[PDB]
């Protein structure tokens, strides 16, 4: 009966790039999800399969919290059945997803005058990701018949690109922080429960 460490995830000082999205597994704690739904600080809070307020009476063996930053125009891809550079090549939720997607504007932390270029996304990959896969490869993408042997050039493109967030960007181009909560149940040790 210790409380779940959501402050570690939502209020973490640093967030991951989407290609390397960070996930913390949270277990053996009590979670109150209604405080989040009424946080009013979140511009996206969409749940799939389960209900947000209704599941606060539920228990699971483990909940996973995946987190990352993308631009606002891409938050809609963090949902089942969507397509685009993020869903295809960076972070893909499954069709049978049971969980919640939570997002909020982070222009004031992750933008910098002249651009914050530390946040990257994967632009080139030969195949789409399967659900919940994480590709951190930086191999040069071979768009022609000639092997690249680690040297960038014609038909040989570095696979990650920077967002370059600037504070004067329009809302669709400003950074948004995202947390995906996944609800796991197996063999029922029941470690993460509601109040």
């Amino acid at each position, epitope marked *: 009966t210790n409380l779940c460490p959501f402050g570690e995830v939502f209020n973490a000082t640093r967030f991951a790039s989407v290609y390397a999205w960070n996930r913390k597994r949270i277990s053996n704690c009590v979670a109150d999800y209604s405080v989040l739904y009424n946080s009013a600080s979140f511009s996206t809070f969409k749940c799939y399969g389960v209900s947000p307020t209704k599941l606060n009476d539920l228990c699971f063996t483990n909940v996973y919290a995946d987190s990352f930053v993308i631009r606002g125009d891409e938050v809609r891809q963090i949902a089942p059945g969507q397509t685009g550079k993020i869903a295809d090549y960076n972070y893909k939720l499954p069709d049978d997803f049971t969980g919640c997607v939570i997002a909020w504007n982070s222009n004031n932390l992750d933008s910098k005058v002249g651009g914050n270029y530390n946040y990257l996304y994967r632009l080139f990959r030969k195949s789409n990701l399967k659900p919940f896969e994480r590709d951190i490869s930086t191999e040069i993408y071979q768009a022609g018949s*000639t092997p690249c042997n680690g040297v960038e050039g014609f038909n040989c493109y570095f696979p990650l690109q920077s967002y370059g967030f600037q504070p004067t960007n329009g809302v669709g181009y400003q950074p948004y922080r995202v947390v995906v909560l996944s609800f796991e149940l197996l063999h029922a040790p029941a470690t993460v429960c509601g109040p």
Partner: antibody
Amino acid sequence: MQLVQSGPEVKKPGTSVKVSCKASGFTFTSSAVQWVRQARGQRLEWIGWIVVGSGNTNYAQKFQERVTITRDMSTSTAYMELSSLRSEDTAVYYCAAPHCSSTICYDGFDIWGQGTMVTVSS
Amino acid sequence: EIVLTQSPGTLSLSPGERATLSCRASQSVSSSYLAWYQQKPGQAPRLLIYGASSRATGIPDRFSGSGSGTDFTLTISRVEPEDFAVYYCQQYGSSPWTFGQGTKVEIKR
């Protein structure tokens, strides 16, 4: 299939000029676009190039501070803009790209634009 | 900057003869990124050869190309009259992707 370019341009010294390359008949998203120029009766000269997918550019030092290569994938065209035009910049400007399918790209510049004549004189 | 010197400056051949143009580099260049182009006056270049060896789709069997290191050649086995034009070699392995001076293939009488 093809690459088509802007009209011809004549500009006074010190101004800018922006010519365009519209792609037709191949999956433009996955290719790259290189801009070169050629004085009348002289050799070809490499200006720069750009990666259609990522927008990253490389420029020869001759033009590092004066040329800007961009692309709009929505209309699937590329642009070369030369500012602070010198007299000696008058030439035909060609734009070239490798034709690409959904799966693979060509290992050389096979598609060439028709060229745009650009004359710089007071 | 990679310099590309072409030889000869201009060769003159009666139709049906053999043509051999050469491209030489100031230092070794990847053979995977070296190309030859045929340009006629007024027109834009046509890609003749890519990767120093491979023929561009739709270009006739007449044309061939070889070489590596610093020496590259383009060979026209039997120069049909359509083949009298300028030929430029371009490397594109190391930026800047420079060009040769071009050799002029004129017809001899």
